[PDB]
Design a protein around this ligand. Structure first.
Ligand SMILES: *[C@@H]1O[C@H](CO)[C@@H](O[C@@H]2O[C@H](CO)[C@@H](O)[C@H](O)[C@H]2NC(C)=O)[C@H](O)[C@H]1NC(C)=O
Ligand SMILES: *[C@@H]1O[C@H](CO)[C@@H](O)[C@H](O)[C@H]1NC(C)=O
Ligand SMILES: *[C@@H]1O[C@H](CO)[C@@H](O)[C@H](O)[C@H]1NC(C)=O
Ligand SMILES: *[C@@H]1O[C@H](CO)[C@@H](O)[C@H](O)[C@H]1NC(C)=O
Ligand SMILES: *[C@@H]1O[C@H](CO)[C@@H](O)[C@H](O)[C@H]1NC(C)=O
Ligand SMILES: *[C@@H]1O[C@H](CO)[C@@H](O)[C@H](O)[C@H]1NC(C)=O
Ligand SMILES: *[C@@H]1O[C@H](CO)[C@@H](O)[C@H](O)[C@H]1NC(C)=O
Lengths: 256, 360
């Protein structure tokens, strides 16, 4: 039941200081800690994708690279999860993250994914994949897409563990990648142990019931993590309130 | 320390005082999400040996004690691992294979064995790491009319490879002439029925066999034995094992408000100063046990053999006892009178021999 419904346009924006996350689970209070990890560089080039369905294949699969920074200002219902893998077909294992209001289901199976996968609303996953076989992992938990509000995620695939970091930062009229620092709390660490080189975003489409699906638009930001050394400021309560990217400029390098 | 039998008058730093650990405290997260052994070793219906049931086991805690106490076992043979160590071992994947065979053939379910079952129904590799478990099932699987729902493969063209299953019912062709898919002379259907009856001899009574195969792969191992909660003791110097982080320290109450993800805490100098208990979500201030520099204050040996001991940096309540800023001085009596310094104790305190006295 694979159908091509989504067309995608892309623009370029500034990362500013977004994408900082807690590098470890260690509590640190009132200290400056320098860590070398996969971080999104400050003021880096971030791609803004507009996905439009109006009532051909124009929604290509993005490369995962070394990790992905994801942001969206859209409401929770429109964007429903992500797809991770290498070949995105039956031959290799793949990771599917699907959110619905009650809960989140994270499941790793041999999905034969469609070229333009989308969740259609009861909710059916037939559009997302034709078949799933040899399924080896399932994790069900409270959802992380809940209800203006910018939702930020960081995905890393390090040493056989899929680390997911998230933050929910409210924003006003100001541009969707805001100024300031919102540290991303570690959310879910999964021992998937699979190779991930490509990823795709999942959108939700409503049936028209009158042009099979209702017209929709979704805007999201994708940035790529790079191996970088950061200096993080831990306040009295253990929150990361500030950071400097050491390699970005001489002043920050001196600070580092 | 001085490598001499005569000691000149003075204070000599000779040893380091330590508070020995009294108890061992291991705190691990609550046992939960146990592997479903109760659905493998206690099933209403088992499977035929030809169509042997395989359950993959992953992402759970392996409590083998329930397996141990389920029933009296005719064989609990374990190949390549000892039975006791299983709980303390963690494996990447556990495969549970369940089938019913006659008792005589239980011996065939082992590496290096031959028979109808080994060649054509279930085969174990020579290097197999796992255990084979068998128990009598007369009540569950025997009927007086005869239980004809358990089948075995008697005829196959080639021997089975290890961990292989054949579900084909194709007529076995033992003769040059084609069978044509209809049973005929010299053509025999491969699957035969195990006609179990309650009055059969022990060799032929139905036995339920579960084979546990343990495999380790490059992926992180997610099936490991139960973690002991033990108990938590506070306000004393106890060796602590918290989630695989080890040390020796007192665990005092903590005023630090951790964020929910955070589990451990560190100092400015990257030394652990706090921890979150796995069993109960509370924060504890880890403080290492008291240490001191033991210094011996003595006059010349020829004059006297009396000595006094200074514990540097140690309060007197944690070890002629006097408390000084330098530490606790034992064996010297404080005198209000002031004299010139003879043996320096530090912090304005000096010692002299007149017994040994300490003074400002
Ligand atoms: C949201 O997702 C959850 C999990 O996939 C769904 O909950 C399951 O619903 C099925 C019905 O087909 C039940 O058999 C399961 O027992 C449910 N599981 C849990 C953990 O509740 C839920 O139905 C979905 N809701 C919508 C509106 O799609
Ligand atoms: C971002 O990348 C695009 C093409 O990849 C480029 O045209 C644009 O100049 C870049 N933005 C900045 C600020 O350099
Ligand atoms: C994957 O599925 C196919 C068909 O279902 C099967 O032949 C193959 O053995 C399976 N592989 C694993 C590792 O389960
Ligand atoms: C991961 O997948 C890519 C894309 O197929 C492949 O080139 C690479 O060799 C894979 N890595 C490993 C370790 O197999
Ligand atoms: C930290 O926690 C204290 C105690 O709850 C609180 O008063 C304070 O506002 C918090 N934030 C900062 C930045 O100190
Ligand atoms: C095991 O089997 C017996 C047989 O009747 C049953 O009474 C018991 O409840 C079973 N136990 C479990 C844990 O399934
Ligand atoms: C673990 O057990 C303790 C005591 O039984 C209980 O208070 C706690 O809620 C349990 N769960 C966790 C996650 O600590």
């Amino acid at each position: 039941q694979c159908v091509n419904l989504i067309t995608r346009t892309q623009s370029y924006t500034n990362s500013f200081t977004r994408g900082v996350y807690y590098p470890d689970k260690v509590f640190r209070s009132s200290v400056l800690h320098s860590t070398q990890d996969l971080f999104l560089p400050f003021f880096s080039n971030v791609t803004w994708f507009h996905a439009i369905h109006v009532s051909r294949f124009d929604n290509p699969a993005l490369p995962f690279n070394d990790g992905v920074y994801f942001a969206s200002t859209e409401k929770s219902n429109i964007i429903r999860g992500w797809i991770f893998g290498t070949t995105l077909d039956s031959k290799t294992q793949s990771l599917l993250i699907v959110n619905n209001a009650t809960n989140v289901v994270i499941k790793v199976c041999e999905f034969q994914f469609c070229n333009d996968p989308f969740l259609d609303v009861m909710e059916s996953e037939f559009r997302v994949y034709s078949s799933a076989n040899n399924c080896t992992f399932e994790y069900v938990s409270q959802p992380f897409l809940m209800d203006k509000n910018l939702r930020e995620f960081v995905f890393k695939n390090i040493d056989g563990y899929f680390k997911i970091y998230s933050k929910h930062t409210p924003i006003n009229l100001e541009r969707d990648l805001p100024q300031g620092f919102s540290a991303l709390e570690p959310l879910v660490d999964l021992p998937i142990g699979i190779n991930i080189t490509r990823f795709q975003t999942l959108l939700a489409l409503h049936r028209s019931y009158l042009s099979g699906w209702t017209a929709g638009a979704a805007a999201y930001y994708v940035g790529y993590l790079q191996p970088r050394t950061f200096l993080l400021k831990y306040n009295e309560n253990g929150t990361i309130t500030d950071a400097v990217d050491c390699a970005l400029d001489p002043l920050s390098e001196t600070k580092c | 320390t001085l490598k001499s039998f005569t000691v000149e008058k003075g204070i000599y730093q000779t040893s380091n005082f330590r508070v020995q650990p009294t108890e061992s405290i291991v705190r691990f997260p609550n046992i939960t999400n146990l592997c479903p052994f109760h659905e493998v070793f206690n099933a209403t219906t088992f499977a035929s040996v030809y169509a042997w049931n395989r359950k993959r086991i992953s992402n759970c805690v392996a409590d083998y004690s329930v397996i141990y106490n389920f029933a009296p076992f005719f064989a609990f043979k374990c190949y390549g691992v000892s039975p006791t160590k299983l709980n303390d071992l963690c494996f990447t994947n556990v495969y549970a294979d369940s089938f019913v065979i006659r008792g005589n053939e239980v011996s065939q379910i082992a590496p290096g064995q031959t028979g109808n079952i080994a060649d054509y129904n279930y085969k174990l590799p020579d290097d197999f790491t796992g255990c084979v478990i068998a128990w009598n099932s007369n009540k569950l699987d025997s009927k007086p009319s005869g239980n004809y729902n358990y089948l075995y493969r008697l005829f196959r063209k080639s021997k089975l490879k290890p961990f292989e299953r054949d579900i084909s019912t194709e007529i076995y062709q033992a003769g040059n002439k084609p069978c044509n898919g209809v049973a005929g002379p010299n053509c025999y259907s491969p699957l035969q029925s195990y006609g179990f009856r309650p009055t059969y001899g022990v060799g032929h009574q139905p036995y339920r066999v579960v084979v546990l195969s343990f495999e380790l792969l490059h992926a992180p191992a997610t099936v490991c034995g139960p973690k002991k909660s033990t108990n938590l003791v506070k306000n004393k110097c106890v060796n602590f094992n918290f989630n695989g982080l080890t040390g020796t320290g007192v665990l005092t109450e903590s005023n630090k408000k951790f964020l929910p993800f955070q589990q451990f805490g560190r100092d400015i100098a990257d030394t652990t100063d706090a921890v979150r208990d796995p069993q109960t979500l509370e924060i504890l201030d880890i403080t290492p046990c008291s240490f001191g520099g033991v210094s011996v204050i003595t006059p010349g040996t020829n004059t006297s053999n009396q000595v006094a001991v200074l514990y540097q940096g140690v309060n007197c309540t944690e070890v002629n006892v006097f408390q000084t800023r330098a530490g606790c001085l034992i064996g010297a009596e404080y005198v209000n009178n002031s004299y010139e310094c003879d043996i320096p104790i530090g912090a304005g305190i000096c010692a002299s021999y007149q017994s040994i006295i300490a003074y400002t």
